[PDB]
Amino acid sequence: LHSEIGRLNNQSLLWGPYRPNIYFGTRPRIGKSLMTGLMWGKIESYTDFQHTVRYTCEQNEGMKGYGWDEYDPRRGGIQSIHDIQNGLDITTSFVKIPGGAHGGSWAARIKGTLNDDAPKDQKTIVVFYVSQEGENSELEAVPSENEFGYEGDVILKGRSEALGNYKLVVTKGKGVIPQSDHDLSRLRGPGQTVVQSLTYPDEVLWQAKPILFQQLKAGIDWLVENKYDVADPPPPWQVYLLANKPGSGNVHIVQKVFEGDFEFDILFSSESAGKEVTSKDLEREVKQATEVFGERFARVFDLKAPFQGDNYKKFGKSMFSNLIGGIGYFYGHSLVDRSYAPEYDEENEGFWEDAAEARARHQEALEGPYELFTSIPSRPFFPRGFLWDEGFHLLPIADWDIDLALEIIKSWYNLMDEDGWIAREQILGAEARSKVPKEFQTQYPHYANPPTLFLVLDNFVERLRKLDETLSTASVDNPEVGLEYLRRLYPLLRRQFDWFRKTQAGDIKSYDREAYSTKEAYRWRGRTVSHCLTSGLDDYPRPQPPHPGELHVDLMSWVGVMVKSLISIGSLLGATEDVEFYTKVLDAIEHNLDDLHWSEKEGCYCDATIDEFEEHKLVCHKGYISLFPFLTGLLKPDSPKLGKLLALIGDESELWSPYGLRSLSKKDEFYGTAENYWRSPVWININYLAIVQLYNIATQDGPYKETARDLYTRLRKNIVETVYRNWEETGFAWEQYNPETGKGQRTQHFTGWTSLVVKIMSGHH
Ligand SMILES: C[C@@H]1CN(c2ccc(NCc3ccc(CN4C[C@H](O)[C@@H](O)[C@H](O)[C@H]4CO)cc3)c([N+](=O)[O-])c2)C[C@H](C)O1
């Protein structure tokens, strides 16, 4: 039955607008295949369009906002885009129609509306760009009756091993098409939809904007050659109308010009399915998808007081839709340094200078290709897989569609090397690379990242103990199926656990350090003088200088998180030898936390180092780091240490701000210093962990029940209101929140773990 559910899942998920790096575009979950993309831009002059055209996502003064109003990757969704610069409000509706053997059919309506500021008679160029990769695949534009282009629908007929036979239609659509009285119309027509069919080497098909501009440039060149000049020039919008040249090729550019508002439809008809998809089909399925989304949202995300209000509901559906709507499929080579230089061992004082020199040998090389299906932090800034980010992303998604979450987990785990490493940032393919400066591309196999995907597995396990609707929860409704998934995955989790122990180990035995166990101690590789990028908390203060004797409490706590999970799952698979080993490790980490990381003087957990005189020193910077054993659920609900931590959490003069917990205490000497990335701001992911854990204490008999309840109540409210106030005033979810003013700061469109706010509002952990 497992293989059955798997086949149906493949078929359900194959098609999507899985190109979140651009405003609107589709591709299937197949590395080399058919992809589409939307471009648009006002044209007012002879030079302006190169500046106005839109394709890849950004955020600047010219763009008010954009995002998904509803989305499910199984059904589709609606996207809004508010473009100030081009004076346009765009809707993109995408929907999926199951049937056939090839992942079904889809359709999209593109609707544009001039806003109040735009000239009523603005000319807008719209382009739909289609490419196909494959050695055996074909795609052809059916030519038009008319002389110079199309009065009606453009039909592309194609075939591939992947997709079977298919037909992609770009409808005539509604809207005023400008007509030119110029002489040039004798040769190029007065104005109409036009198509160019081109062929380039597969590996450059993705560069739609440059491909396009080279054609525009060739049209203009042709004008100048044929004596169209400034003595009497054609209208701008006609200079940038391509000559019609439909045919076969691996690239097809469809171009329309509108005056005022417009709409058109894109219809993809899988031949192996029923009759072809119609515009009538599109509207019906859109209505249907919205109804289904409505119904699911209110079961899964039942917002509890005081967020029962309709304004909170809209906020929730926006945050949730943007998170899940950011799901991408990515395909290509990664850049990895596979030298395993000895300098990366960081066993020396000054190790950071050694490792810089090893990196300057530039031994890195492309490898793969790999594929990844994942959600992302940020469409405009970070449209790619980040390992510990995904652990947070998949918590709300799991609620919505557990089967979808497990697919993404599976996708991540299939990237793991034989050693147990997964690169923390997955930049797959040249397209992906185009958004990342060269300095930041290379991944290193000694760099770790918090194992947050373990949290999502933890939720899966609890749910397991305790057609699209059927498929979304198939893996928990069918315990046979759930266990098979775990059986297959379990080895990989174990591998990763061992990888952590081998590569991220700290040094107990080489110093004057007594502790309960001689095994358990951890040090993040990769730190520089001011940074520990691999821990996830970029610039959180750490022992100065970095030192091979350092021990990091956050890292050890992450290991704790992993062992607990391995016990849960290994129990369920009857891996008895395995569970007993885990149990010794849990026991040891519990003691070692206290023996090496607990500070009695300061009353919290701390990182450690080694003295100028070779002795173990605690280094305390009160902040998120300090509470890690708590945030990870390793402290017994009755512990005196827990109490001391709750004092810190609640203390206004330390971590507690009106707007959530500060990353670092106001009392710390490094508060609001340097880049201030994690040296004061409020971050929703860590606040989420605090909230979930406080609620855990509040719902059990114990000494801290009442205290925890008070803190849970206020923190939940403070975080939700902060994210919401900002969302109201700005339209955006932000990366982090200022603890003095409550304003969102750093990057916009962070959906992104900011979206956990949906889970916070709905409660019942
Ligand atoms: C669109 C493109 C953006 N570019 C660009 C890309 C990358 C980087 N640094 C790498 C980087 C990557 C991710 C984050 C976010 N965030 C940080 C949290 O701290 C982590 O915990 C969390 O893992 C993580 C993910 O959310 C922060 C920094 C920089 N840069 O630093 O100058 C610039 C420049 C070009 C011009 O434009």
Six-digit token string for 595:
């023996």
Of the candidates 16, 38, 44, 161, the residue with the CA atom closest to the CA atom of residue 110: 38
What residues contact residue 386 under an 8 Å CB cut-off, 6+ apart? 376, 377, 424, 425, 426, 449
Centroid of ligand 1 to alpha carbon of 159 (angstroms): 39
Q: Is the CB of 150 under 6 A from ligand 1?
A: no
Helix, coil or strand: residue 11: helix
Centroid of ligand 1 to alpha carbon of 603 (angstroms): 34
Q: Is the CB of 582 under 6 A from ligand 1?
A: no
Centroid of ligand 1 to alpha carbon of 669 (angstroms): 26
Residue located via tokens 């009160």: 622
| Under 8 Å between Cβ of 320 and 396 | yes
| Under 8 Å between Cβ of 125 and 255 | yes
Whether the bond between 420 and the residue before it is cis, its omega within 30 degrees of 0, is no
Cα separation, 329 vs 407, in Å, equals 12
Q: Is the CB of 240 under 6 A from ligand 1?
A: no
Helix, coil or strand: residue 509: coil
Compute, in degrees rounded to 10, the torsion defined by CA atoms 669, 671, 674, 675: 160
β-bridge pairing 660-661 and 736-737: unpaired
DSSP β-bridge partners for residue 375: none
Of the candidates 238, 203, 280, 312, the residue with the CA atom closest to the CA atom of residue 46: 238
Closest residue CA from atom 3 of ligand 1: 381
Cα separation, 450 vs 387, in Å, equals 8
Closest residue CA from atom 20 of ligand 1: 536
The conformation of residue 130, written as its DSSP 8-state character, comes to E
Six-digit token string for 291:
């109804």
- For residues 172-200, one letter each, b for 16 or more C-beta atoms within 10 angstroms of the residue's C-beta and e for the rest, the string is bbebebbebebebbeebbbbbbbbbbbee
Q: Is the CB of 440 under 6 A from ligand 1?
A: yes
Cα separation, 141 vs 158, in Å, equals 9
Centroid of ligand 1 to alpha carbon of 546 (angstroms): 23
**Backbone break loci in the chain, preceding residues, C–N > 2.5 A:** 466
| Under 8 Å between Cβ of 555 and 577 | no
The conformation of residue 379, written as its DSSP 8-state character, comes to T
Six-digit token string for 386:
């980040």
Cα separation, 668 vs 524, in Å, equals 22
Q: Is the CB of 435 under 6 A from ligand 1?
A: yes
Rg (alpha carbons) of the chain, rounded to whole number: 28
The conformation of residue 443, written as its DSSP 8-state character, comes to B
C-beta atoms surrounding 310 within 10 Å = 8
256 vs 115, 149, 349, 379, CA distance in Å?
20, 10, 64, 27
Q: Is the CB of 437 under 6 A from ligand 1?
A: yes
β-bridge pairing 598-599 and 425-426: unpaired
| Under 8 Å between Cβ of 589 and 560 | yes
Q: Which atom of ligand 1 is nearest to the CA of 678?
A: 19
Residue to mutate (ligand 1; options 384, 386, 439; most atoms within 8 A of CB): 386
DSSP β-bridge partners for residue 254: 128, 195
660: left (phi over 0), alpha (psi -120 to 50) or beta: left
The conformation of residue 505, written as its DSSP 8-state character, comes to B
Residue located via tokens 């194959």: 14
- For residues 615-640, one letter each, b for 16 or more C-beta atoms within 10 angstroms of the residue's C-beta and e for the rest, the string is ebbbbbbbbbbbbbbbbbbbbebebe
β-bridge pairing 365-374 and 604-605: unpaired
| Under 8 Å between Cβ of 610 and 665 | no
Cα separation, 593 vs 606, in Å, equals 9
β-bridge pairing 105-114 and 251-270: antiparallel
Centroid of ligand 1 to alpha carbon of 382 (angstroms): 6
* Domain boundaries of the chain, sorted by first residue: 22-274, 328-374+380-489
DSSP β-bridge partners for residue 195: 254
DSSP β-bridge partners for residue 575: none
| Under 8 Å between Cβ of 607 and 552 | yes
Which active-site residues does the annotation give?
Answer: 538, 735
Cα separation, 658 vs 590, in Å, equals 33
Whether the bond between 437 and the residue before it is cis, its omega within 30 degrees of 0, is no
DSSP β-bridge partners for residue 197: 252
Q: Is the CB of 377 under 6 A from ligand 1?
A: yes
What residues contact residue 413 under an 8 Å CB cut-off, 6+ apart? 422, 489, 492, 493
CA 482 to chain centre: 25
- For residues 678-701, one letter each, b for 16 or more C-beta atoms within 10 angstroms of the residue's C-beta and e for the rest, the string is bbbbbbbbbbbbbbbbbbebbeee
C-beta atoms surrounding 378 within 10 Å = 23
Cα separation, 54 vs 252, in Å, equals 18
| Under 8 Å between Cβ of 411 and 304 | no
Six-digit token string for 15:
């098609």
Cα separation, 642 vs 636, in Å, equals 8
Centroid of ligand 1 to alpha carbon of 379 (angstroms): 12
Cα separation, 497 vs 561, in Å, equals 10
Q: What is the resolution of this structure in A?
A: 2.6
Question: Which amino acid would we find at residue 120?
Answer: K
- For residues 644-675, one letter each, b for 16 or more C-beta atoms within 10 angstroms of the residue's C-beta and e for the rest, the string is bbbebbbeeebbbbebbbbbbbbebebbeeee
C-beta atoms surrounding 219 within 10 Å = 17
Cα separation, 645 vs 643, in Å, equals 5
Q: Which atom of ligand 1 is nearest to the CA of 377?
A: 26
Six-digit token string for 712:
């849970």
Cα separation, 428 vs 329, in Å, equals 10
Closest residue CA from atom 23 of ligand 1: 536
Closest residue CA from atom 31 of ligand 1: 440
Q: What's the residue count for the chain?
A: 765
Centroid of ligand 1 to alpha carbon of 64 (angstroms): 22
Centroid of ligand 1 to alpha carbon of 535 (angstroms): 15
Of the candidates 507, 605, 503, the residue with the CA atom closest to the CA atom of residue 547: 507
The conformation of residue 597, written as its DSSP 8-state character, comes to I
Of the candidates 442, 407, 424, the residue with the CA atom closest to the CA atom of residue 327: 407
Closest residue CA from atom 18 of ligand 1: 536
Q: Is the CB of 439 under 6 A from ligand 1?
A: no
Give me the phi and psi of 41, to 5 degrees please: -175, 135
DSSP β-bridge partners for residue 721: none
| Under 8 Å between Cβ of 158 and 269 | no
| Under 8 Å between Cβ of 158 and 139 | yes
Q: Which atom of ligand 1 is nearest to the CA of 436?
A: 6
Six-digit token string for 235:
């209208």
Helix, coil or strand: residue 83: strand
Question: Which amino acid would we find at residue 62?
Answer: G
Cα separation, 753 vs 277, in Å, equals 37
| Under 8 Å between Cβ of 375 and 68 | no
Six-digit token string for 693:
């854990």
Helix, coil or strand: residue 513: coil
| Under 8 Å between Cβ of 408 and 373 | yes
302 vs 291, 297, 651, CA distance in Å?
16, 7, 31
Helix, coil or strand: residue 366: strand
Q: Is the CB of 533 under 6 A from ligand 1?
A: no
Contacts of the segment 462-467: beta carbons below 8 A, 24+ positions apart: 463/402, 464/572, 467/8, 467/12, 467/98
Closest residue CA from atom 13 of ligand 1: 382
Q: Is the CB of 737 under 6 A from ligand 1?
A: no
Helix, coil or strand: residue 218: helix
Centroid of ligand 1 to alpha carbon of 111 (angstroms): 33
Cα separation, 467 vs 470, in Å, equals 5
| Under 8 Å between Cβ of 711 and 726 | no
Closest residue CA from atom 14 of ligand 1: 382
Closest residue CA from atom 1 of ligand 1: 381
Residue located via tokens 């210093």: 673
- H helix intervals, 414-503: 429-433, 453-465, 468-472, 474-477, 479-503
β-bridge pairing 598-599 and 604-605: antiparallel
First to last CA, the chain: 31
Cα separation, 149 vs 184, in Å, equals 15
Q: 270 burial class (0-12, 13-18, 19+ CB within 10 angstroms)? A: buried
Cα separation, 553 vs 593, in Å, equals 7
- H helix intervals, 66-167: none
C-beta atoms surrounding 292 within 10 Å = 16
- For residues 530-550, one letter each, b for 16 or more C-beta atoms within 10 angstroms of the residue's C-beta and e for the rest, the string is ebbbbbbbebbbbbeebbbbb
Residue to mutate (ligand 1; options 55, 63, 376, 381; most atoms within 8 A of CB): 381
Six-digit token string for 340:
């395993």
Whether the bond between 190 and the residue before it is cis, its omega within 30 degrees of 0, is no
| Under 8 Å between Cβ of 683 and 719 | no
Six-digit token string for 747:
């990057």
Q: 167 burial class (0-12, 13-18, 19+ CB within 10 angstroms)? A: middle
Cα separation, 154 vs 168, in Å, equals 8
Centroid of ligand 1 to alpha carbon of 739 (angstroms): 22
Six-digit token string for 63:
């763009």
- H helix intervals, 371-467: 387-400, 402-413, 429-433, 453-465
Of the candidates 73, 56, 59, 77, the residue with the CA atom closest to the CA atom of residue 9: 73
Q: Is the CB of 201 under 6 A from ligand 1?
A: no
Q: Is the CB of 746 under 6 A from ligand 1?
A: no
Complete DSSP assignment for 736-750: EE-TTT--EES-S-B
Of the candidates 166, 52, 21, the residue with the CA atom closest to the CA atom of residue 106: 166
Q: How many Cα atoms occupy the beta-carbon half-sphere of 476 within 13 Å? A: 21
| Under 8 Å between Cβ of 422 and 446 | no
Which H or E run includes 266?
strand 251-270
Give CA angle at 454 (366, 493), nearest 5°: 60
- Could you tell me which CATH class the domain 22-274 is placed in? mainly beta
Cα separation, 457 vs 442, in Å, equals 29
| Under 8 Å between Cβ of 425 and 501 | no
Helix, coil or strand: residue 99: coil
Which H or E run includes 685?
helix 684-698
Centroid of ligand 1 to alpha carbon of 745 (angstroms): 14
| Under 8 Å between Cβ of 579 and 567 | yes
The conformation of residue 578, written as its DSSP 8-state character, comes to H
Q: What share of the chain is helix, strand, coil (3-state, %, to 5)?
A: 40, 20, 40
Secondary structure of 305-354 as H, E, C letters: CCCCCHHHHHHHHHHHHHHHHCCEEEEEEEEECCCCCHHHHCCCCCHHHH
Helix, coil or strand: residue 514: coil
What residues contact residue 114 under an 8 Å CB cut-off, 6+ apart? 87, 88, 89, 120, 122, 260, 261
Of the candidates 73, 105, 91, the residue with the CA atom closest to the CA atom of residue 325: 73
- H helix intervals, 593-637: 628-631
Q: Could you tell me the sign of the dihedral formed by the alpha carbons of 434, 81, 315, 474, in that order?
A: negative
Cα separation, 469 vs 8, in Å, equals 12
Cα separation, 92 vs 111, in Å, equals 6
Q: Is the CB of 613 under 6 A from ligand 1?
A: no
Closest residue CA from atom 5 of ligand 1: 436
Give CA angle at 585 (581, 588), nearest 5°: 140
Compute, in degrees rounded to 10, the torsion defined by CA atoms 249, 251, 257, 260: 140
Compute, in degrees rounded to 10, the torsion defined by CA atoms 153, 159, 164, 167: 0
Complete DSSP assignment for 224-264: HHTT--TTSPPPHHHHTSPPPB--BSSEEEEEEEEEEEEEE
Residue to mutate (ligand 1; options 375, 426, 433, 440; most atoms within 8 A of CB): 440
Six-digit token string for 584:
């010794």
β-bridge pairing 736-737 and 744-745: antiparallel
